[PDB]
């Protein structure tokens, strides 16, 4: 492939644990181990807003653009929501009695999912005073990642250190199915292929592998090997035929999504990679990753 990758913006900071693109402004949100969150305009290279949220790591953060909010989760057990235009704190509540690993936002209903070291996923309804609408129980270790199926967001996936992915339906108490990944050091990350042509999911593990799954047959389609330490994440790009992964080995890898072979390994020089975002409508094919020593926003093509 000819990826002709370009560095749009990179900056140094404390360890970046969460990262997200705004869908209509050229902004990236980073959430840091130091308790701070930053919003950067990566085209003008100017800091839009930052907040010292807490003294504990902020492990998860997303835009909720349609409400002009960011939502963040931290090791002090709290979910907090801020208006990014005013800095006003909209809500602040204890969500789990343990670390919050991952937050996902429903695209068309006022729902947020949080996944936690307390072994659960919780569904919150912001139009019902941030009510706890449902708790999804069944995992047996830390829930590391939650993601809605973008083609059917009445369902979502959770990836867990118990070596499984569970796929759930809103309003139902048990998984539609449990995938036994064979990733024996656990699942750190799960994501969906975004287009209707493939029923695919992808998982990343401390066992150095990435696996692609057909969620209709439950078969493992491919195993991607090459990373040299824990794989923090792997995602399908929304508009290019590639998969992007990142690792504690300090690299991003770009894999061909047809052949499942590595195309490019990038050492961006920020030590360990922890988190990923892709621009949701594929603007400039932008991707962004957070690392021990800061973040980078890259364009492809």
């Amino acid at each position: 492939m000819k990826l002709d990758i370009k560095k749009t913006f990179s900056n140094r900071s404390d360890r970046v644990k969460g990262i997200d693109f705004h869908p209509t402004e050229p902004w990236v949100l980073t959430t840091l181990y130091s308790g701070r969150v930053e919003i950067w305009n990566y085209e003008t290279q100017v800091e839009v807003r930052s907040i010292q949220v807490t003294e504990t790591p902020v492990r998860a953060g997303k835009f909720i653009a349609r409400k002009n909010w960011i939502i963040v989760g931290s090791d002090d057990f709290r979910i907090r929501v801020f208006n990014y235009n005013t800095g006003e704190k909209v809500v602040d509540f204890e969500a789990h009695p343990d670390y919050i690993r991952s937050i996902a936002v429903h695209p068309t209903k006022p729902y947020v999912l949080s996944g936690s070291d307390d072994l659960t996923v919780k569904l919150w309804n912001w139009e019902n005073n941030w009510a706890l609408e449902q708790t999804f129980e069944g995992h047996e270790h830390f829930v590391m990642c939650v993601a809605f199926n973008p083609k059917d967001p009445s369902t979502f996936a959770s990836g867990c250190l118990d070596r499984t992915v569970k796929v759930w339906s809103l309003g139902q108490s048990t998984p539609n199915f449990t995938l036994t990944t064979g990733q024996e050091r656990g699942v750190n990350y799960v994501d969906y292929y975004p287009l209707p042509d493939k029923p695919y999911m992808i998982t990343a593990s401390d066992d150095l592998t990435i696996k692609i799954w057909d969620y209709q047959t439950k078969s493992c389609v491919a195993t991607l090997e090459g990373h040299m330490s824990n794989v923090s994440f792997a995602v399908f790009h929304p508009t290019l035929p590639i998969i992007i992964s990142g690792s504690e080995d300090g690299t991003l890898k770009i894999w061909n999504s047809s052949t499942y072979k590595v195309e490019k390994t990038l050492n961006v020089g920020l030590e360990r990679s922890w988190c990923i975002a892709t621009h949701p409508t594929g603007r400039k094919n932008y991707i962004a990753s957070g690392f021990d020593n800061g973040f980078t926003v890259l364009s492809l093509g």
Binding site: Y99, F142, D206
Partner: peptide
């Protein structure tokens, strides 16, 4: 553990 806290 480092896994917990990293």
């Amino acid at each position: 553990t480092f896994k917990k806290t990293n």
